Design a protein around this ligand. Sequence first.
Ligand SMILES: C=CC[C@@H]1/C=C(\C)C[C@H](C)C[C@H](OC)[C@H]2O[C@@](O)(C(=O)C(=O)N3CCCC[C@H]3C(=O)O[C@H](/C(C)=C/[C@@H]3CC[C@@H](O)[C@H](OC)C3)[C@H](C)[C@@H](O)CC1=O)[C@H](C)C[C@@H]2OC
Ligand SMILES: [Cl-]
Ligand SMILES: [Mg+2]
Ligand SMILES: [Mg+2]
Ligand SMILES: [Mg+2]
Length: 150
Amino acid sequence: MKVGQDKVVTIRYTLQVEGEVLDQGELSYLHGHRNLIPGLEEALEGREEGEAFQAHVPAEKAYGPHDPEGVQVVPLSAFPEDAEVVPGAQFYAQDMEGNPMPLTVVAVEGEEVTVDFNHPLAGKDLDFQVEVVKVREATPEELLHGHAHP
Ligand SMILES: C=CC[C@@H]1/C=C(\C)C[C@H](C)C[C@H](OC)[C@H]2O[C@@](O)(C(=O)C(=O)N3CCCC[C@H]3C(=O)O[C@H](/C(C)=C/[C@@H]3CC[C@@H](O)[C@H](OC)C3)[C@H](C)[C@@H](O)CC1=O)[C@H](C)C[C@@H]2OC
Ligand SMILES: [Cl-]
Ligand SMILES: [Mg+2]
Ligand SMILES: [Mg+2]
Ligand SMILES: [Mg+2]
């Protein structure tokens, strides 16, 4: 069975960015419902069960470009009372509506912390080694819920 719309697809993958392995695992996902980054989904379309391949996904088809508006300066007093506020530290946060807006610390100067609200992989090209392990039809329950089930 080939990867396509409304198939549940099981893949084994390794993610590398700029020569460094960032993640590895196995995933089952519902194909064609914006559940995967667009570029990888495009690369998987039409693949047969058992196929293995490499996929270089440009930032634009992955987590998008780095938005300069995402880099902001916030007061140090906004951070958890006894947290370590240093470059690379991550904190969850939300916007003025309530949508998830996690951040990464870029730099600290006195009581001012420069943070980045961009996705950590924004602007990065992603390299995947991928194996298609299984392809099956989605169940009605999966189609109604919009994602794969165990
Ligand atoms: C609770 C339910 C949520 C569910 C949560 C998890 C299973 C927990 C687990 C830690 C998530 C991922 O672990 C599998 C982990 O995988 C990465 O490490 C990774 O290697 C990656 O990039 N992958 C995974 C392998 C397929 C390609 C890509 C992906 O497409 O992943 C998909 C993805 C993020 C798609 C977004 C969806 C929103 C779109 O807007 C965006 O479009 C840009 C693309 C994953 C599979 C989602 O469908 C499933 C979820 O997120 C990300 C670097 C970080 C990501 O952690 C956050
Ligand atoms: Cl899914
Ligand atoms: Mg069909
Ligand atoms: Mg097989
Ligand atoms: Mg100032």
